[PDB]
C-alpha cells in the first residue's frame, strides 16, 4: 500500500541507497518507528508495510538526503526531507510518495491510486 | 529507449489521456513529427520509438497540458509543456521524460539509465 | 536573516495567510519554538528573527499547507511542509525558504546569501 | 508587465546571467522575436516590455538553461526551458515567470496579477 521513490535532479538518475524511515504518529503525539529501508537501484523502496498494518493515521516519511549528497561529495542544504500525511481509507488504496532531490531544493508528490 | 510519464499534482494521480507529440529537429531547423500518443491509465506513454530509429539529435516532447486541464473544467496557464533535449549515445540508453502538472506550474525531469 | 515565500501553483498567485512555525533544536534534542508568523498578500513572511537571535543551530520551518488549503475549502494530501536545515554554522547568512504548493505536491528551495 | 526570475537549485542562489528570449506568435503562425535580455545578479530580468507593447497574444519565453549550465562548465540535459502561454486576453495583467533549475530537471511557475 506504500511505495517511496527518489530521484536525483543533478544526475538525472534514481537516487540509490538512500535511507528512508517511516513513522506513525502515536496517541501521545510522538513519532513511532513504523518501517524503514534503503532505496534500490531503481530509486524505489517497496515492501515497507502491508494493508493490514497500514491503518488510517498520520505518517511521516523521512528521507536521508544529507547522507546521499555527502556520499557524492556534494554539500547539501537540508538535513533530510520529510513528508507528513494522513492515510485515509476513503481515498484510493496505494500511495506512492515520490521525491525529486537537488542540493538546495526538493519536490515531493503523492500519487494515490486504486 | 523513450518513455514519457505525466502526473497531476492537483489530484495526486497519473494524468490520463494526455496527448503527447515528439518531434526531431531536421537539418533545416524545423521540427518534424517523430512519434505521438496519449498517456495510459498509469500516466505513461510507452512504445514511442525503437533503438534503431532514436538516433542522436535534438528532440522535443510537447505535452498537451491545456486540453488536460480543460477536460477537468479547470482553466490553466500554459498552452502546452515542451521538453527539448539532445539524445546522446555516450550516456545511458533509456530516457524517461517525466512531467508533474499543476494549472499554473509544471516540473519536468529526465531519468536516464542503462 | 530568515524570510519565507510561498506560491500557489493552482491559482498562479502568492499563497496568502499561510501560517509558518519555526523551531530550533535544543540541547536536549527537542524542537523548541523559535518564531512564527503568516505570509502576507505578497506570499512573503518577513520579520521572523534578528541577526542576534538567529544563532547557529538546526532549524525547522513548518509551513502549514493543510490549514492553508482547508481555509480555502480544499482537502489536501500533506499535513504541512517541513524544511530542516543547519543555519549559520560558517557565520551569519541570509536565508530565503521558498515553497510552491499544490494540493498533492510541493517544492521547496533555499536561497542562501552572504551579507 | 513581464518579469522572469530564475533560481539555481544546485547552488541555492539566483541564476545569474541567464539569457532569455521572448517570442510572440504572428498572424502567419511563426514565432516572431519579441524581446530578450539576461538575468541580473538577483536572478531577475526586468524591462523586457511595456504595457503598450505587450498586447494580447501567445508568447513563448525561452530560458537558455543549457547556455547557463555550459557557461558554468556543466553538461546539462535540456536545451532550454520554453514557457508558452496566452497573455492579456482579458485585459492587461502582470506576469512573473519563475524557473528553478537543476542540470536534469526544471520547474516553472507563473504568478499573474491584475494591476
D44 is in an annotated binding site: yes
Look up residue C10 and give its DSSP letter.
T
Long-range Cβ contact pairs of C70-79 (< 8 A, separation 24 or more): C71/C17, C74/C103, C75/C103, C76/C103, C76/C104, C77/A85, C77/A110, C77/A112, C77/B12, C77/C103, C77/C104, C77/C105, C78/A83, C78/A84, C78/A85, C78/A108, C78/A110, C78/C106, C79/A58, C79/A84, C79/A85, C79/A86
What residues in D contact B108, CB-CB < 8 Å? 78, 105-107
Q: Other C-beta atoms within 10 Å of A20: how many?
A: 22
What residues in B contact D83, CB-CB < 8 Å? 78
Method: X-ray
Across the A:D interface, residue pairs with CB atoms under 8 Å apart total 39
What residues in A contact B110, CB-CB < 8 Å? 12
Taking a C-beta distance cutoff of 8 angstroms, is the pair B21, B36 a contact?
yes
What residues in C contact B104, CB-CB < 8 Å? 8-13
| Residues composing chain B | 114
Q: Which chains touch D (3 or more CB pairs under 8 A)?
A: A, B, C
Q: Where are the beta strands (DSSP E) in A48-103?
A: 57-63, 78-87, 94-102
Nearest partner of C83 among B43, A106, B17, judged by Cα: A106
Cα distance between residue C63 and residue C79, in whole Å: 9
For an interface test with D, give the residue of B64, B79, B81, B106 to mutate (most D CBs within 10 A).
B79
For an interface test with C, give the residue of D109, D112, D114, D115 to mutate (most C CBs within 10 A).
D109
**From residue A48, how far is each of A35, A37, A98, B13, D61 by CA, in Å?**
6, 7, 14, 21, 43
Look up residue B69 and give its DSSP letter.
H
Q: Which residues 86-115 in chain D show a CB within 8 A of chain A?
A: 100, 102-105, 107
Q: Which chains touch A (3 or more CB pairs under 8 A)?
A: B, C, D
Q: Which three cell numbers stand for residue C77?
A: 494530501
- Tell me how close the Cα of D7 comes to any Cα of chain C, in angstroms: 8
Range of the domain at A16: 1-114
Taking a C-beta distance cutoff of 8 angstroms, is the pair C112, C88 a contact?
no
Q: CA torsion A83→A89→A91→A96, rounded to 10°? A: 40
Interchain pair D10, A102: CB under 8 A? yes
Look up residue B93 and give its DSSP letter.
S
Nearest partner of D66 among C79, B101, B85, judged by Cα: B85
D40 is in an annotated binding site: no
* CATH number, domain with residue D87: 2.60.40.180
What residues in D contact B113, CB-CB < 8 Å? none
Q: Which three cell numbers stand for residue C44?
A: 512573503
Cα distance between residue B100 and residue B7, in whole Å: 5
Interchain pair D78, B77: CB under 8 A? no
Domain count, chain A: 1
Taking a C-beta distance cutoff of 8 angstroms, is the pair A1, A47 a contact?
no
Which of B79, B109, B111 is closest, CB to CB, to D85? B79
Q: Other C-beta atoms within 10 Å of C114: how many?
A: 8
Q: Are strands B78-87 and B2-8 parallel, antiparallel or unpaired?
A: unpaired
Which of A78, A84, A111 is closest, CB to CB, to C83? A78
Amino acid at each position: 500500500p506504500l511505495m517511496v521513490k527518489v530521484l536525483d535532479a543533478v544526475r538525472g538518475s534514481p537516487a540509490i541507497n538512500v535511507a528512508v524511515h517511516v513513522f506513525r504518529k502515536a496517541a501521545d503525539d510522538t513519532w513511532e518507528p513504523f518501517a524503514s529501508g534503503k532505496t534500490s537501484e531503481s530509486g524505489e523502496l517497496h515492501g515497507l508495510t502491508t494493508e493490514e498494518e497500514f491503518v488510517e493515521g498520520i505518517y511521516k516519511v523521512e528521507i536521508d538526503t544529507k547522507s546521499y549528497w555527502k556520499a557524492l561529495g556534494i554539500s547539501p542544504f537540508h538535513e533530510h526531507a520529510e513528508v507528513v500525511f494522513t492515510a485515509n481509507d476513503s481515498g484510493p488504496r496505494r500511495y506512492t510518495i515520490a521525491a525529486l532531490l537537488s542540493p538546495y531544493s526538493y519536490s515531493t508528490t503523492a500519487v494515490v491510486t486504486n
